Amino acid sequence: MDLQLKQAKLRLLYFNIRGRAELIRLVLNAAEKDFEDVRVSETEWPSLKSKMPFNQLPVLEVTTPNGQKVMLTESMAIARLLARTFGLYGDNAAEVYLIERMNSLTSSLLEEIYALGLKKVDSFKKLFEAEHLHEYMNAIEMALKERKSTFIAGPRVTLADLQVIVLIDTMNKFLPNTKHECKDKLDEIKEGVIRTKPGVARYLRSRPATDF
């Protein structure tokens, strides 16, 4: 049941976007754990999907040091497993609550942003939005302003600070003009991840420039 992820061969299968696998890429690069970053095209997906157990990406294909191949699914479960493996998931239940409180907020905001941008036809679409996303934005901003530590859950980077990067980069693409104080507070966290996780700094510099 122990996959020995520190030493296991890892292959990440996902599309060539940030999307929902970027958090996993950020964890692995923060830990400086090598992995094959396999970026699948929608053209390849039907046959890969057909030849493979799973039906949804991302999948983390793990080959343990003893040679056993295991296909892990569910993006957040994978990310948290990897975070725990590499010391990026806090040291006690109270720190983890801080991680998961923030990840709940930012995961919610992310999915809400993801769902916007797919209903542009007719009727009256001047109908107001924002207040949903605003609600998440002030909760995040309030939490970041109230914290008594450098990062979200303490003095060191955890998974929640990494997901803040995913959120920032989604906001700057989907919501370029949106000006709100939560963006500044999120950018502070990103700056500290870059400063303290040289593997992330290098990865962010070198990763493909994509829209999604």
Domain membership flag for residue 16:
yes
Q: What would you report as the CA-atom Rg of the chain, rounded to the nearest whole angstrom? A: 18
Structure's resolution in angstroms: 1.8
- The CATH number of residue 79's host domain is 3.40.30.10
Q: Which residues, in sequence order, are bridge partners of residue 61?
A: 11, 71
33 plus 111 within the same structural domain: no
Pairing label, strands 59-63, 9-15: antiparallel
Residues 6+ apart with CB under 8 A from 204: 165, 194
Among all chains, which residue has been given the structure tokens 């104080």?
181
Domain membership flag for residue 36:
yes
DSSP 199-212: HHHHHHHHS-----
Domain membership flag for residue 209:
no
Q: Which residues, in sequence order, are bridge partners of residue 13?
A: 38, 59
193-201 own/partner pairs: CB under 8 Å, 24+ apart: 193/30, 193/157, 193/161, 193/162, 193/164, 193/165, 196/156, 196/157, 197/29, 197/30, 197/157, 199/29, 199/30, 199/31, 199/32, 200/26, 200/29, 200/30, 200/162, 200/165
- Chosen domain end from 39, 64, 87: 87
Count of other CB atoms within 10 angstroms of residue 132: 15
Q: 20 vs 17, 73, 74, CA distance in Å?
A: 8, 12, 10
Contact 29, 157 (CB under 8 A): no
56 plus 80 within the same structural domain: yes
Domain membership flag for residue 202:
no
Distance between CA 208 and CA 81 in Å, rounded? 25
Q: Give residue 45's domain range.
A: 9-87
Q: Write down the experimental method used for this entry.
A: X-ray
Beta strands in 78-167 (DSSP E): none
Q: 24 vs 80, 142, 165, 176, CA distance in Å?
A: 9, 26, 12, 24
81 plus 104 within the same structural domain: no
56 plus 99 within the same structural domain: no
Helix (H/G/I), strand (E/B), else coil: 23: helix
Distance between CA 212 and CA 32 in Å, rounded? 24
| Total structural domains within the chain | 2
Helix (H/G/I), strand (E/B), else coil: 10: strand
Phi/psi of residue 163, nearest 5 degrees: -70, -25
Q: Which residues, in sequence order, are bridge partners of residue 39?
A: 14
Distance between CA 147 and CA 149 in Å, rounded? 6
**Number of helical H runs and strand E runs in the chain:** 8, 4
Domain membership flag for residue 132:
yes
130 plus 155 within the same structural domain: yes
Position 131: which residue type? E
101 plus 169 within the same structural domain: yes
Count of other CB atoms within 10 angstroms of residue 85: 18
The reply to whether omega before 65 is within 30° of 0 (cis) is no
20 plus 115 within the same structural domain: no
Distance between CA 64 and CA 190 in Å, rounded? 32
